[PDB]
Write a protein that binds this DNA or RNA. Structure first.
Lengths: 92, 108, 93, 84, 96, 79, 89, 104, 103, 89, 96, 79, 84, 94, 91, 107
DNA sequence: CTGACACGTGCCTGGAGACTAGGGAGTAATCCCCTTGGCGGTTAAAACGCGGGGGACAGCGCGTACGTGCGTTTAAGCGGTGCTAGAGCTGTCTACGACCAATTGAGCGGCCTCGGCACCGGGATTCT
DNA sequence: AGAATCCCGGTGCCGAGGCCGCTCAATTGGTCGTAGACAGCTCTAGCACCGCTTAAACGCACGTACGCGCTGTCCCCCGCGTTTTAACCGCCAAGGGGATTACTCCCTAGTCTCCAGGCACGTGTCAG
DNA sequence: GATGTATATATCTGACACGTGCCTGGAGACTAGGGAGTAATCCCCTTGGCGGTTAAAACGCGGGGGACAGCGCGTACGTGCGTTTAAGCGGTGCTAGAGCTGTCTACGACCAATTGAGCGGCCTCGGCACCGGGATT
DNA sequence: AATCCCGGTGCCGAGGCCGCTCAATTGGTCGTAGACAGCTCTAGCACCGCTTAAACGCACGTACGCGCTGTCCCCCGCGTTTTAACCGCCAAGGGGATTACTCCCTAGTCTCCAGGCACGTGTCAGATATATACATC
């Protein structure tokens, strides 16, 4: 089975524009976009772990990779989202 | 044994924390993976998805259509002055171009 | 119509549209030709030729936008081959 | 005994006029078309060579679209729309 | 006695392509780097080699941009490079 | 105001190495702006590497890595 | 610190036994070797995963060598790669 | 004990490349023939660089290789330059290359 | 499993080894001689026939006849060197008129 | 009268599919094979004799091939014989 | 009446006979000449039917080769007609 | 007399095959002479082979071997 | 470090004139020398390649004149005097 | 002296004389120049150079003979490069 | 040790011209001349055996090779003294 | 109980037994008949004598008493049978016969 | 006048004297095919005549190409000191291919055929 | 205008190609004599380099002999016609000698011997 | 006419090139078990072949708006000098923090039993597209 | 004349329900490496006097980019022809993709010893200095 992110993109779509559907061509574009940014971030997180002789990728590595890869305002809001997520998950 | 409550529902996310943690471990990025990596990554991927779709739906509404198609995603990505930087090398099939005529070409 | 009255209309027309513009069959026969150098007995899946066509058509549209900027810089409206050769050199091709 | 012959005239001059019209080109010296085919040919040679290299490593005889997508990514001009 | 224009500029070009020393001064660049960096974090500290690696990268980048600028300049059939030549080169390169 | 330390002669000589025979008088301030942008886009990465390491001293490996991620790999100060 | 600073010297003695090398240029050579090593290992790893394979064999190195190096280098490199492997085996 | 590099007839260390592979995470397995092949490739490219650098040195009648000779090497072979285009070499300078329209 | 099928050849390694031993060329014959010789004879056979069939196809005929072999051998700029003294019965000549003779 | 005709016919059916061969051409080929066989075995014998060796090996046949055939044919003939002897080994 | 110009048919003869592959000397007279020569070296000889064809093929190939060499010698001499001196030079340089 | 059985038109046809457009009329007796010297050589060798075998018929192999010895090998008749 | 530059002038024009003056030559066109040196180089290459082939088969590093004699003999131009 | 009288003297001489006429040392370096393209660091017996020189002088003299015949057939006395080419072609090496 | 014919050419020279000497170069030439004609005759003798599917070389194969290779006036005198030698030997 | 050489049986100077040995070791055939080496020796002796007689007469024409390669060239190139036997051969030190073409000599 | 030829010496390994084993060639007889022999007829080709203009080749003209002669200069040839890479020989032994045998299926000679070619003819186009 | 080349179409045959029998030349398992792959020595002659020598390498002036060109002409070969003869096809004869066979032998390869022919090594004188 | 870089002889001082100790990285060998090589299959989607009509492609016309070759001009920047200033050098001085050794415990690699979240499939019904006509630019 | 806009037809794609199974969850041990504590010794920052190479401001001269002008020729807009693209129907079979058996290849482990990496050395390659030649404009 070819696992895909399609159901999750569809859930997200129905929270910003509840009237709108999406064609399979656009769904396949989104499905490629997710894989691309996943690979880039995991790449830089790996390098940052290796250079400091640490064995481990933690939340600090992902934060630093995000600040390196995304433009500044996107990095700010991404960090705010990840911080809120990890804080509320820790509070659980 | 407690009734399961998926980690996405502890984080308050729709993206699959389980799958993204699996893919972090299996992808040979590093020999150990901490529990704070996948929640953060899935949160950022959700953020970027919703970011793109919010502009694409506006383009779709101006087309007076109920459906998003690649033309509208091209409009969204190329109109945002920062998403154009992240995806500057990417080319989208069936996307076409933004209307663009240099002022010198038009008549007086 | 006056010269270029319709050239603008064609620009406006085709930039609005999203269809492929090369004839599929000749493009396919050229792909099947060029492939013949690196091996014989090659076959192409139906989607592969479309992928190639999309790639080449977008490549060329990008080259032509760059060429147009070069021509305008030259204080000209017509694009000429020198504009391609400079475009490619600053790109480092 | 079936063997191909040159089809380089196959990319019609009208087709290139339509492409360049998507680039917003207004006026074009006629010498352009044969240069433009030459450039296109060098491009196609590159991409196909890479594609074939992938096909061979897998011991396939059909070229698959993933071969093309990977070759394009290695060249650094990523194509979205065909999986991967 | 006076040389005519360009002949000594020609001597300069041949020299500086023959010579291979760094051409930006160390101390002013060292302060400029400190001034820029402190806006990201105060009380930073620098290895003496990191400044030299920066100066090497900056010199190489500017030399390459000026090469492309000179090609843009000869295309317009000028010999003087113009600010618009820099802007065009930067746009076609895809950084502008 | 340390950017004035990139003097006009230091610019001219780099233009000479690039082959420029004749230099317009407005080029210098544009060149300074371009260099300031490049420096900021390198130093921000260098300092991000410095901070993740918790170091307070910047190391030349950080500058090499800032160039390498940005594509402009440098040989000589490390490997 | 590990470095390649023995083996470059050996090769130099084979190529030009009268000639010396500055430590700066030895450092350059060390980084050149590390760079091409990382490129080849990267593309070998990619070519494994596309085929859902688990190991790197000589074939993945050979295919990466043909993909990355221009055509005249690629022939001679693959020739002496297979010559080395036949001697080893 | 007899070294694997002397088995292969190579100067570069087979065992060091084999170790560096296994610790680089590039794959969960490494096949026995890979590090020999990779060492041979790296030795070939090193030899190719150094030969040109040496001939550049003796053009100067210098006898110590310095980075200017390596820049003169890389920028004068059309295959090496294509392999090494995205790279800056410290102390390397440029090739003397005035454009023809500029000369009188 | 015939040695031709170990070598991957159609030519008869057994026969060519027999003829090497019986032909009084030398008092001992090693096992690497006949495989190499049979391979090279196969190669040159296939080489000639590949050109000959092209001429045959241009003749729009299904059959190779000596005229086609002569066209093959005399057109290839290196086989003409190997077979430069050889003459082929029923072969004829390549069309050849000196430019000075024509109007 | 043993002949090479069946082997030529097999080879023919690997290069051209629907084409047959007349007996006149078959007899020409049958003479060509015998001629090149005799020439190569001749020079291989001389090379063995001059070095005071008793034996014709693969080296003698290789050297004779490099002497008798033109250069490009010699290259591909050596590549064929090398591949054959390697895979046979 | 119709009449071609001199040599109009000569070229047509060349084009016709280079295209074909038949033997051109009369078989019976040639066989009689063969039997007349052989009578010197022995008496009451006989010839197999293929032997005379082999001789005729050899002799016709020999003469065609000599004639091509003669034509090159004649053209060298700045002439179109072949004359006996061109045969005698061709044979001398060939070492006959 | 049998030397005149090789007729003038046969010589014309052979000269035509070899690309000869115009022929002086003295060529014919010289050509008959050259052919005669060639035939004498080949037949002398043929008979010599026939005699060593103690045969009375000339065979095609005798001609093939004689032509090989003279160095102008014929393919087509076995051997 | 030594690598030979051409000695193409080393076979002096006097030397070629002295050879030609053995072969009956009253007179010599001035364009003969270039064609002669070309012919001579071709011949030398065609002999040395064989000689070196024999040298290699024997594994010798020193060329022996018997190699040259055999190179001539296989090529048909047998030489009497330096061996037998 | 008028043209050809001394050339006649030279031909009579050098058909009478029998020494080798190329200089040893140049021919030696030209061997050392060409062979290296097949294998560098070749070594030569001193006789092998002499055997080469003998062969090359005999070959060239014979070519010049044939050339001179070709020259007289054109009713020239000057040997021309085309005479060499034709001679070589009829000989069958071109 | 090298074999050579350097005795026998001298003996024949003493029979033909007992006043005359010979240089070592010309003796070497004679040695190669003898080796050459020997190899020609032995070659054609071997050919003439195999065409008849015979196994030996007899006097007949030498005689036929002698008639094939040597021009006509040499061939008669050579064959005469060949058969004279053989009749003396066998008697 | 006594030994007498086969060449002295044959009345030849050349060695019969050496030719017999050289044949058997030359692989030319798997058998050698007893009469062959006598015949072959006689042929070689005949040809040697024929060469040396002419060389001697050439030496006497120079009033030299030592034969040298020039005289062997003078022998071979002046007998129409010897030249036809030995056409494909270069003799060291031999030079050429003085042989100006008639058209070249003045009127 | 000086050293290459022409002679003299030791000695060892190549040849000759004799007996042996067994198979390549000489022999007598046969078969039969393919070679030499004769004959008819028609009709392709060769032979003999005509017409004539395009070729071979004999002549005058001409301007330049290179043969002959000199002063400059340079490096090919000579005698020599020096070394050591590798050519050439002795010793060890073991990797391998010559030669046997029992076995059997790959390639040759034969009959049959059926369809690709060749032989046949008619109409359209090229080219002189 | 109209002659020859081309091209399109139909008839029917004899050659290539398939199947078949079958037998002899390729295969596998095997021993063992050896010569050639490797180890070591050692002493030739090849390459590097020094100074001296002057024969030959080199550039130049210059003079007229030679190759290339235009022109003519006449005679002989090419293109065409009518006659006629022996080539070519095909049928019927028949017998010489190529090609095969079974018996036989006398010729040559193999072996041990021992002794002397001629091949290194030392010499000096008379041809150059 | 006269200023630029090239080349030759000499000093001298430290970067290269060598030699030493020794330790931790590699090699020799045996082990366990699973990633890849193999033989056989299915079937789909690729390449084969045909008709017809009609969009697309091709060839010609007309011609005036573009490319670009020319003369003019006034100012913008290369060249050259005297003034002055601070980058580079050698040095004294310190101590923030970079780099190493030691302790131990917070945590994440890997197992297992469990089960419901996401994929492949059928169905459909209505949003889109295909169609056409009349108004406006 | 072309773009726009308003209206009708009907189909094949998105979207719902459905089965279901395999990849996520929870409870758990335990080897460790990395968080913290302490040390200590490098080299970075701070400060001093000396040096003179470089930077700076200015004069000035003419070479260069920008402007107006012309012209001719070549594509852009339009027409008629014609050809092979495009659609769609019918064939069929090669090779992508899946599977069950098997093995021989690589990771894991202990060893011990020597390769090469710190630490000590010194000399000859080079920079520097002085001298001066001839190429260039």
């Amino acid at each position: 089975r070819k696992e895909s992110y399609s159901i999750y993109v569809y859930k997200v779509l129905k929270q910003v524009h509840p009237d709108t559907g999406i064609s399979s061509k656009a769904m396949g574009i989104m499905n490629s976009f997710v894989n691309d940014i996943f690979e880039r971030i995991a790449g830089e997180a790996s390098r940052l772990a290796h250079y400091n002789k640490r064995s481990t990728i933690t939340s600090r590595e992902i934060q630093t990779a995000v600040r390196l890869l995304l433009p500044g305002e996107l990095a700010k809001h991404a960090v705010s989202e990840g911080t809120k997520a990890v804080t509320k998950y820790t509070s659980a | 044994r407690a009734k399961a409550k998926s980690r996405s529902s502890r984080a308050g996310l729709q993206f699959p924390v389980g799958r993204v943690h699996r893919l972090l471990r299996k992808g040979h990025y590093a020999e150990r993976v901490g529990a704070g990596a996948p929640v953060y990554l899935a949160a950022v991927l959700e953020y970027l998805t919703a970011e793109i779709l919010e502009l694409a739906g506006n383009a779709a509404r101006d087309n007076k259509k109920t459906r998003i198609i690649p033309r509208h995603l091209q409009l969204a990505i190329r109109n945002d002055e920062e998403l154009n930087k992240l995806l500057g090398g990417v080319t989208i099939a069936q996307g076409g171009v933004l209307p663009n005529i240099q002022a010198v070409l038009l008549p007086k | 119509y006056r010269p270029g009255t319709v050239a603008l209309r064609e620009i406006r027309r085709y930039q609005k549209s999203t269809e492929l513009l090369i004839r599929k069959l000749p493009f396919q026969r050229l792909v099947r030709e060029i492939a013949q150098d690196f091996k014989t007995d090659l076959r192409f899946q139906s989607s592969a030729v479309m992928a190639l066509q999309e790639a080449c058509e977008a490549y060329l549209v990008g080259l032509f936008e760059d060429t147009n900027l070069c021509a305008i810089h030259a204080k000209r409206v017509t694009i000429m081959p020198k504009d391609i050769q400079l475009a490619r050199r600053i790109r480092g091709e | 005994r079936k063997v191909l012959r040159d089809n380089i005239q196959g990319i019609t001059k009208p087709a290139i006029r339509r492409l360049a019209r998507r680039g917003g080109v207004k006026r074009i010296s006629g010498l352009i078309y044969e240069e433009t085919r030459g450039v296109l040919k060098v491009f196609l040679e590159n991409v196909i060579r890479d594609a074939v290299t992938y096909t061979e490593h897998a011991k396939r005889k059909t070229v698959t679209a993933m071969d093309v997508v990977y070759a394009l990514k290695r060249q650094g001009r990523t194509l979205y729309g065909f999986g991967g």
